[PDB]
Amino acid sequence: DLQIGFYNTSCPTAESLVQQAVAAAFANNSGIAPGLIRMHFHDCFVRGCDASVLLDSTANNTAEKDAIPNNPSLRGFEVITAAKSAVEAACPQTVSCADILAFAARDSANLAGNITYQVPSGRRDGTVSLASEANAQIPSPLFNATQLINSFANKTLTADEMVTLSGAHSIGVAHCSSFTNRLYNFNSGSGIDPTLSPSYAALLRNTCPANSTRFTPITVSLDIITPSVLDNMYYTGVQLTLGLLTSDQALVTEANLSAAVKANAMNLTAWASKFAQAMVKMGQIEVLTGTQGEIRTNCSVVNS
Ligand SMILES: *[C@@H]1O[C@H](CO)[C@@H](O[C@@H]2O[C@H](CO)[C@@H](O[C@H]3O[C@H](CO[C@@H]4O[C@H](CO)[C@H](O)[C@H]4O)[C@@H](O)[C@H](O[C@H]4O[C@H](CO)[C@@H](O)[C@H](O)[C@@H]4O)[C@@H]3O[C@H]3O[C@H](CO)[C@@H](O)[C@H](O)[C@@H]3O)[C@H](O)[C@H]2NC(C)=O)[C@H](O[C@@H]2O[C@@H](C)[C@@H](O)[C@@H](O)[C@@H]2O)[C@H]1NC(C)=O
Ligand SMILES: *[C@@H]1O[C@H](CO)[C@@H](O[C@@H]2O[C@H](CO)[C@@H](O[C@H]3O[C@H](CO)[C@@H](O)[C@H](O[C@@H]4O[C@H](CO)[C@@H](O)[C@H](O)[C@@H]4O)[C@@H]3O[C@H]3O[C@H](CO)[C@@H](O)[C@H](O)[C@@H]3O)[C@H](O)[C@H]2NC(C)=O)[C@H](O[C@@H]2O[C@@H](C)[C@@H](O)[C@@H](O)[C@@H]2O)[C@H]1NC(C)=O
Ligand SMILES: *[C@@H]1O[C@H](CO)[C@@H](O[C@@H]2O[C@H](CO)[C@@H](O[C@@H]3O[C@H](CO)[C@@H](O)[C@H](O)[C@@H]3O[C@H]3O[C@H](CO)[C@@H](O)[C@H](O)[C@@H]3O)[C@H](O)[C@H]2NC(C)=O)[C@H](O[C@@H]2O[C@@H](C)[C@@H](O)[C@@H](O)[C@@H]2O)[C@H]1NC(C)=O
Ligand code: HEM
Ligand SMILES: *[C@@H]1O[C@H](CO)[C@@H](O[C@@H]2O[C@H](CO)[C@@H](O)[C@H](O)[C@H]2NC(C)=O)[C@H](O[C@@H]2O[C@@H](C)[C@@H](O)[C@@H](O)[C@@H]2O)[C@H]1NC(C)=O
Ligand SMILES: *[C@@H]1O[C@H](CO)[C@@H](O[C@@H]2O[C@H](CO)[C@@H](O)[C@H](O)[C@H]2NC(C)=O)[C@H](O[C@@H]2O[C@@H](C)[C@@H](O)[C@@H](O)[C@@H]2O)[C@H]1NC(C)=O
Ligand SMILES: *[C@@H]1O[C@H](CO)[C@@H](O[C@@H]2O[C@H](CO)[C@@H](O)[C@H](O)[C@H]2NC(C)=O)[C@H](O)[C@H]1NC(C)=O
Ligand SMILES: *[C@@H]1O[C@H](CO)[C@@H](O)[C@H](O)[C@H]1NC(C)=O
Ligand SMILES: *[C@@H]1O[C@H](CO)[C@@H](O)[C@H](O)[C@H]1NC(C)=O
Ligand SMILES: *[C@H]1O[C@H](CO)[C@@H](O)[C@H](O)[C@H]1NC(C)=O
Ligand SMILES: [Ca+2]
Ligand SMILES: [Ca+2]
């Protein structure tokens, strides 16, 4: 199975090299932190954590990158490229893109919230990437509680782990189109989702047009309280009708989920520890190991 310090011998500085690339990119643009954490999530939820999400589309293959949930919202690809460049120079053909992405998400959590943990490694890189699979496997923000739980259960994660991992929305942004469903033509008198603060809704409407699509270059911070700190304020917001996504608000529509939200909002240390543990578990979903797959030399294309 995956082991912490898989590269102890084959590439002693692998993890430091990645961290330095992530740190440099984060200083340039703090948005790479949520970008990379989300990217690792999207890796792990399609064919497991095998770097499939990193592959560029080609003439004969439309890759995950071009899926609805991924294009153009995914970001941080250049950081992975930069990290891979450094690692290949230091230890040729040794460190997988899948491991680099897992390392980078951990480094991002540390930079954005001082949340740190050790990452089991030894993942191998897959050779398949399909927009169709990402389209089907990535959860929708329109999902209700039951749908979110079921989605995550199919990926080995418990309902509580789903609530914990949703706390990643304590940083980063969402395109208007991901929540305009709550702002316009909702089944209500105002046309607005009643579970969203009317005052928050008013301001969101002034920022996001009803005709927004995933390509409309307008985004809004997921956490209105501390938009750039990976803390537990996401939960505080969710309890106050300030959760931004339908799937965020979903977390207070069922007893057990609501209790978890309450617990996380009350105790940063407790949530942060659970988040670290859940990230580690997520990063082991359907991984390729041993001689399975390959060590991809260029994270954007399968080896030839
Ligand atoms: C890459 O390199 C790193 C760094 O070396 C490896 O990580 C380290 O791995 C070692 C084990 O190889 C591990 O050592 C201790 O494990 C537990 C820790 O225990 C908790 O803390 C308390 C301690 O009282 C409690 O016991 C535990 O709940 C210890 O139990 C264990 O010690 C006992 O075992 C030793 C040796 O077998 C004996 O004395 C006796 O049987 C004891 O019962 C290990 O102990 C410690 O021994 C050292 C002796 O020199 C001592 O100096 C030091 O205190 C040391 O901790 C380290 O904790 C761990 N380091 C970190 C930071 O995590 C890594 O290994 C992989 O990942 C780790 C986490 C394990 O899962 C390994 O199995 C795994 O291989 C290396 N990676 C690879 C792939 O090789
Ligand atoms: C890591 O992996 C990624 C993904 O593969 C790679 O990025 C790709 O690089 C290729 C070039 O190697 C690039 O291809 C096109 O650039 C232009 C796009 O319009 C185009 O002019 C050019 O057309 C040509 O090549 C053939 C033969 O030489 C001829 O038709 C022309 O003379 C022309 O030169 C490139 O090609 C199209 O060619 C393919 C033919 O099979 C065709 O099937 C593809 O559609 C291709 O577009 C490609 O666009 C690019 N992919 C993406 C998504 O960006 C990395 O390459 C590096 O970064 C790239 C952005 C480029 O700057 C490239 O020069 C860099 O080397 C690669 N990293 C490294 C270090 O190799
Ligand atoms: C500090 O952060 C900013 C924000 O990320 C960096 O600026 C960006 O740099 C990227 C290139 O690495 C620019 O992307 C290109 O845009 C071109 C014109 O549209 C495209 O043709 C080209 O493909 C790039 O685009 C898309 O490319 C990827 C596909 O391969 C996509 O995954 C991704 O979505 C991307 O948009 C980007 O436009 C630019 N952003 C801004 C707001 O300027 C910045 O990078 C450096 O500085 C910028 C201004 C450029 O000069 C880069 O060449 C340079 O590397 C970064 N500082 C750094 C890393 O030094
Ligand atoms: C539980 C079900 C989830 C749903 C329905 C969901 C949905 C979404 C949506 C729609 C966005 C905005 C995308 C956009 O419009 O640009 C988003 C952003 C984000 N998500 Fe999730 N997500 C879920 C879980 C997770 C998990 C498990 C993680 C990581 C552990 C995560 C990390 C992130 C991050 C960091 C952002 C901001 C990204 C950025 O700013 O680049 N999400 N999510
Ligand atoms: C959350 O979304 C689910 C859809 O994936 C809803 O469940 C499904 O509801 C459909 C209603 O038309 C029904 O056809 C499906 O058979 C059912 N699938 C299952 C069992 O997951 C769910 O709706 C509630 O529960 C289902 C079983 C029915 O009783 C619906 O009438 C209920 O509304 C959604 N949850 C809520 C609270 O709406
Ligand atoms: C998407 O919704 C936008 C908000 O209503 C549209 O823009 C607005 O269009 C009004 C006329 O329809 C115009 O008086 C407003 O000034 C304008 N507001 C802004 C902020 O642009 C938009 O319509 C398109 O873009 C505007 C500027 C005009 O060129 C229209 O003719 C366009 O249709 C809507 N876009 C689409 C694709 O329908
Ligand atoms: C907030 O959460 C932290 C982390 O769980 C709690 O700290 C620990 O307390 C529990 C009590 O059950 C112990 O079992 C752990 O061993 C402690 N570990 C750590 C990380 O300190 C803390 O008690 C919680 N705060 C409050 C007020 O409930
Ligand atoms: C971050 O975490 C460490 C413990 O791991 C702690 O010593 C430090 O004071 C914390 N503060 C920050 C955000 O740097
Ligand atoms: C989940 O994945 C699919 C159902 O969507 C099915 O093939 C598999 O048996 C399910 N079980 C898991 C992996 O929990
Ligand atoms: C929490 O909710 C689940 C599903 O509604 C229920 O089965 C369970 O009994 C509740 N709490 C626990 C873990 O007992
Ligand atoms: Ca994958
Ligand atoms: Ca926050």
Indicate the residue type of 264.
N
Closest ligand 1 atom number to CA of residue 122: 79
Domains and CATH numbers, the chain: 1-138+283-304 (1.10.520.10), 139-282 (1.10.420.10)
Helix axes 97-113, 14-28, angle to 10 degrees: 50
| Cα-to-centroid distance, 207 and ligand 6 (Å) | 13
Cβ density class 148-173: b for 16+ within 10 Å, e for less: bbebbeebebebbbbbbbbbbbbbbb
Q: Name the residues annotated as catalytic.
A: 42
| Cα-to-centroid distance, 5 and ligand 1 (Å) | 12
Rounded CA-CA distance 159/239 in Å is 18
Task: Concatenate the DSSP letters of all residues of 14-70 into one string.
Answer: HHHHHHHHHHHHHHH-TTHHHHHHHHHHHHHTTTSSSSGGGPPPBTTB--GGGSTTT
Rounded CA-CA distance 204/210 in Å is 11
CA distances from 170 to 9, 123, 237 (A): 36, 28, 9
Q: Does residue 56 have its Cβ closer than 6 Å to ligand 3?
A: no
Q: Does residue 209 have its Cβ closer than 6 Å to ligand 6?
A: yes
Nearest one of 83, 51, 76 to 64, comparing CA atoms: 51
CA distances from 15 to 76, 107, 123, 157, 163 (A): 17, 9, 14, 26, 28
Largest CA distance in the chain: 64
Q: Does residue 271 have its Cβ closer than 6 Å to ligand 1?
A: no
235: phi > 0 → left, psi -120 to 50 → alpha, else beta; which?
alpha
Nearest one of 43, 48, 49 to 67, comparing CA atoms: 43
Rounded CA-CA distance 144/174 in Å is 18
Rounded CA-CA distance 106/276 in Å is 8
Nearest one of 243, 223, 239 to 231, comparing CA atoms: 223
Query: Structure tokens of 39?
Result: 């990217």
Determined by which method? X-ray
Resolution in A: 1.9
User: Which protein residue has the closest C-alpha to ligand 7 atom 27?
Assistant: 267
Q: Does residue 150 have its Cβ closer than 6 Å to ligand 5?
A: no
Rounded CA-CA distance 259/252 in Å is 8
